[PDB]
Amino acid sequence: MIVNVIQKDRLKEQKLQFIRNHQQAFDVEPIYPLPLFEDFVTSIEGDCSLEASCKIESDKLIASRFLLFFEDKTQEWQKYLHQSLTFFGLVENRVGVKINYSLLQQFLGSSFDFSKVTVLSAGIDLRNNLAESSLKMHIRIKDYPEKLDKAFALSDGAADGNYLKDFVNLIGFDFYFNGKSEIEIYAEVQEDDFFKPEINNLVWQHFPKTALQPLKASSLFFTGLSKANNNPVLYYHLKNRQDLTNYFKLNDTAQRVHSFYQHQDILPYMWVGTAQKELEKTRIENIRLYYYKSFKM
């Protein structure tokens, strides 16, 4: 048992370290209210992963973006949901804002089967403009067509984007501090399906050739269906973060993030998100970079 208390304290400090390393590299001052997220991730004593992310818009660097993934093998998804919602409610209380939950509420509405959840995340994207700050939640469902339909109904709605409805498993919620809220649905293609002829016909055919090149180094591909019908954001799960510069033409701000993380003590994979048209450019100006670390007993 003494092994357990020592390892719990150590995990608590390693999560805070991962968060501070990211914040201190990109923001001289922490963005308020980061310490509420720090308290939340330290209260999650089961196994988890953390995500630290940068959104780059030309030379603007948005870096107070963090996410916890619940990975306790007991899979008490409903308990994790409740722990995330009470953290959101603490943000509301301390900041003095009211979050608009209606989209999450309607998605969960008609008696939710939590056994169909395979991923749950909770986190933040904090800005000095409070109204532009947001809380975040992702839910991945499996073999749950009733809730797939409900998420589609909740976003912009039917076609198009409906052309990729059968590829959807991940649902994203954003909760802005001004009371605006959004839902997003993500179509995915797994590595083992990359070369199948039906996949080229149903998916790749609708994307420029440049969109296909980073699949060579990716184990997974996502795209958001409802935001930006024009110019959809494309997400690539790079097997090795070192391949980023080989497949994506980085500007100066993104290169600074990449250089910082090349030799950090983190997981080897990353996610890269970029709008479809950025890949047709000679140089990406808008890109989102996501890095990860795991925290296990």
Ligand X SMILES: CC(C)=CCSP(=O)(O)OP(=O)(O)O
Q: How far apart are CA 36 and CA 233, in angstroms?
A: 29
Q: Residue 216 Cβ, how far from ligand X at the closest point, in Å?
A: 18
Interface mask toward ligand B1C for 57-96; x: CB under 6 A? ----------x-x---------------------------
Q: Does 37 bind ligand X (CB under 6 A)?
A: no
Q: Fill in the amino acid letter for 214.
A: P
- Work out whether strand 117-125 and strand 218-224 pair parallel, antiparallel, or are unpaired: unpaired
Q: Fill in the amino acid letter for 222.
A: F
Q: Does 235 bind ligand X (CB under 6 A)?
A: yes
Q: Residue 186 Cβ, how far from ligand X at the closest point, in Å?
A: 5
Interface mask toward ligand X for 193-222; x: CB under 6 A? -----------------------------x
Cβ-proximal residues to 106 (8 Å cutoff; 6+ apart), any chain = 150, 154
Question: Where are the strands (E) in 34-180, listed by range?
Answer: 48-57, 60-70, 117-125, 134-141, 168-176
Partner whose binding site includes residue 136, from ligand X, ligand B1C, none (CB under 5 to 8 Å by kind) = ligand X
Where in 234-293 is the site for ligand B1C (CB under 6 A)? 271, 290
Which residues precede a break in the chain, with C-to-N distance above 2.5 Å? none
Q: Name the nearest CA neighbour of 54 among 239, 219, 284, 228.
A: 284
> Which residues are at the interface with ligand B1C (CB under 6 A)?
51, 67, 69, 118-119, 121, 138, 140, 170, 271, 290
> Which residues are at the interface with ligand X (CB under 6 A)?
55, 136, 172, 184, 186, 222, 233, 235, 271, 273, 288
